[PDB]
Design an enzyme around this catalytic site. Sequence first.
Site, PDB file in Angstrom:
ATOM      1  N   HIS A   1       0.916  -1.007  -0.022  1.00 47.50           N
ATOM      2  CA  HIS A   1       0.112   0.008  -0.093  1.00 47.50           C
ATOM      3  C   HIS A   1       0.873   1.316  -0.018  1.00 47.50           C
ATOM      4  O   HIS A   1       0.418   2.345  -0.003  1.00 47.50           O
ATOM      5  CB  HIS A   1      -0.823   0.148   1.065  1.00 47.50           C
TER       6      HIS A   1
ATOM      7  N   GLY B   1       3.139   5.454  10.198  1.00 48.81           N
ATOM      8  CA  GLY B   1       4.347   5.462   9.536  1.00 48.81           C
ATOM      9  C   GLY B   1       5.237   4.135   9.988  1.00 48.81           C
ATOM     10  O   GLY B   1       6.107   3.884   9.588  1.00 48.81           O
TER      11      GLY B   1
ATOM     12  N   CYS C   1       4.151   0.959   9.265  1.00 45.06           N
ATOM     13  CA  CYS C   1       4.096  -0.050   8.298  1.00 45.06           C
ATOM     14  C   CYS C   1       5.339  -0.432   7.647  1.00 45.06           C
ATOM     15  O   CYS C   1       6.386   0.542   7.579  1.00 45.06           O
ATOM     16  CB  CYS C   1       2.999   0.243   7.651  1.00 45.06           C
TER      17      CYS C   1
END
EC number: 3.4.19.12
Lengths: 299, 296
Positions: free
Chosen positions: A39, A141, A143
């Site tokens: 993503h 932030g 991920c």
Amino acid sequence: FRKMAFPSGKVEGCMVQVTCGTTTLNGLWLDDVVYCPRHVICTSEDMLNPNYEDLLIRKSNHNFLVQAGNVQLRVIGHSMQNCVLKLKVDTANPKTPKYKFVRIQPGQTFSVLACYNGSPSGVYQCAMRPNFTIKGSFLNGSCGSVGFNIDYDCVSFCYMHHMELPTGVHAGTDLEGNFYGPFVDRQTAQAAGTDTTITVNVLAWLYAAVINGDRWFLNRFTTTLNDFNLVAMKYNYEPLTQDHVDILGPLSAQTGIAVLDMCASLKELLQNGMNGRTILGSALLEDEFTPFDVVRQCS
Amino acid sequence: KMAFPSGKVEGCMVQVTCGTTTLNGLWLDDVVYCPRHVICTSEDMLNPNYEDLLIRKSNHNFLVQAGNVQLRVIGHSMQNCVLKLKVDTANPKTPKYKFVRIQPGQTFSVLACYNGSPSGVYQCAMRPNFTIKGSFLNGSCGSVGFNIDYDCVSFCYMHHMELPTGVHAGTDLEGNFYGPFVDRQTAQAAGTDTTITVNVLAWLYAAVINGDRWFLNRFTTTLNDFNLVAMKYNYEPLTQDHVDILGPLSAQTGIAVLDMCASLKELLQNGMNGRTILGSALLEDEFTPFDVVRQC
Ligand SMILES: *[C@@H](O)[C@H](C[C@@H]1CCNC1=O)NC(=O)[C@H](CC(C)C)NC(=O)OC[C@H]1C[C@H]2C=C[C@@H]1C2
Ligand SMILES: *[C@@H](O)[C@H](C[C@@H]1CCNC1=O)NC(=O)[C@H](CC(C)C)NC(=O)OC[C@H]1C[C@H]2C=C[C@@H]1C2
């Protein structure tokens, strides 16, 4: 007993940041490939429901900013494997440890190196719940932060972080991009199964109590595995698998208490309660220490 | 409960051996720091005269191993309970660092090591009675505790011993013990421990931020009235600086510090009544306000 993480340095040496547009997250640099959540190619508005295949077709190598610190790593190829992006880069990471990618079972524990902008912030121990969520500490932030175990000199990467659920727990994939549990990487409301207690870890904890001389709960009885599993489910405990019985082997050998005898002791605790007593200085039974974790700390 | 990333410290751990005694050392630039009791034998540890034992040692009695590589000791001195071994090689992995002495109630990360190799990392608090509730086994001495600010490692603890109660004791990196302890093989008891009140409050704020607030009440209390109850229950007094330090958490949740003190007072007097807070049946006191804020 403490929650104790693995030393994080071998993983710190592999963290990078990956940016598309203004979307930045973390990636994992091993040899000449960087792994990260797919993503990153989403605009905040595309996350509402993305068409990942179409979004990726619109991307070229030159749209990906990969940085180790502030030093850019040139991307020379890209592909998508399930929910992870693989970015081939032109430099092999000189800090690459010996490593493998593994898919863990619920109940297993691992260390998480929480990172922001490719910079490590903290390390902590997590357990994969039976409903395939983890109770982490993750902010925006985070991920692409990874979970791992270390055996001898080898890092086994087992988790990459992708999302938070409405209840505050966290969800993610293995390093092949396959989610743990029924979740998908879309910015939609998703719910985890009702959680249950990790029986094999409770048994590990009872063995740890015995090793330390706290053994009032041992009884003269035993049970079959099937009888135990059917009772345990009535108390929202996980049933045991054959693999669970086997990984309790070492602690059973160390204490001389057969696994099924300990199961009979646990069954009595479930049915009669603690009667005001404690085990290892606690009225609650702990379920986030695995048989391996107990062995690590008792020795 | 979150520890600092340990890589900067891992690159400094080495093994130090003298005789049949092996433990860990910290290799910074061309100096290795380690507990002085590495020079002891079993007989020596009962009542060691360290100055006397050390004068009888030469540089070559110290074997320092950085992985497979032996480092040559070219000098040695003793500073309080720490031995300093000068070696002919500088550690290229030396981070930017400081030595600090921490205050009781402050937290730090421990990198537990055996035979110079890192084993695990976890967060510890310096107890009010100057012990730490660690996880340390035979061979862990020389393991260090630290905090990291920006890229700078502040070393605050080196591990020396375990007490009969199972808690642990050690020194700062100048070799001075935290607490009334001595590096001799004898059973030692600590002073009465107390609970770190400012940290319990910080953890209650954390429980609220994460949606857990069954323990709150509409009552309030003065600072001194709270401190009277705290002292009765062997909690440390709360200072105005503690109140100030809790501000951000107070603002964030809109719960005034003294309102949270009133909640804690009710918990001390009535117990948790079988309920739990952030999963715990007990009030946790090893998260500082900074620890909580950073993680939020
Ligand atoms: C990493 O990019 C980020 C990590 C999140 C941020 C807050 N804590 C976390 O664990 N993931 C993220 O934003 C994902 C992205 C999609 C494409 C998977 N979405 C997400 O975390 O959504 C959270 C849910 C939970 C409820 C509140 C916000 C939505 C609905
Ligand atoms: C490191 O050399 C070692 C670390 C100990 C070992 C068990 N767990 C630890 O934290 N220290 C050590 O052996 C010291 C040495 C003296 C000279 C300071 N002694 C020590 O810790 O004694 C063992 C404990 C266990 C009970 C019996 C004696 C005390 C209390």
